[PDB]
Design a protein around this ligand. Structure first.
Ligand SMILES: O=C1CC[C@H](N2C(=O)c3ccccc3C2=O)C(=O)N1
Ligand SMILES: [Zn+2]
Length: 91
């Protein structure tokens, strides 16, 4: 169930336990680890209306794994989640 950065191999980014389905490839998970955020949130072209995105890269190898999505309104659930490019992860 560990999902690790495919590039550096050793760095766990999330687990299968964290996977969920947002009502509307890209894996969406409630929680992730060992990612650094680059820049500030943007709503431009957001794949999840009502959320803004921030680039998220592996803390070890700087590979771009996906994005942190943050809610633009307080009344939403989850207030944030991660959308991760499946091919960037092992398994
Ligand atoms: O929700 C998202 C995440 C970011 C993603 N995105 C990209 O992957 C990209 C590549 C090049 C130029 C502009 C973009 C962009 O907005 C995108 O289109 N929407
Ligand atoms: Zn890595």
């Amino acid at each position: 169930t560990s999902l690790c950065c495919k590039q550096c191999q050793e760095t766990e980014i999330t687990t299968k336990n964290e996977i969920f389905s947002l009502s509307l490839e890209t894996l969406t998970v409630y929680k992730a680890s060992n990612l650094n955020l680059i820049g500030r949130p943007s709503t431009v072209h957001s794949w999840f209306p009502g959320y803004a995105w921030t680039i998220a890269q592996c803390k070890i190898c700087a590979s771009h794994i996906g994005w942190k999505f943050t809610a633009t309104k307080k009344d939403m659930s989850p207030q944030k989640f991660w959308g991760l490019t499946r091919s960037a992860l092992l398994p």
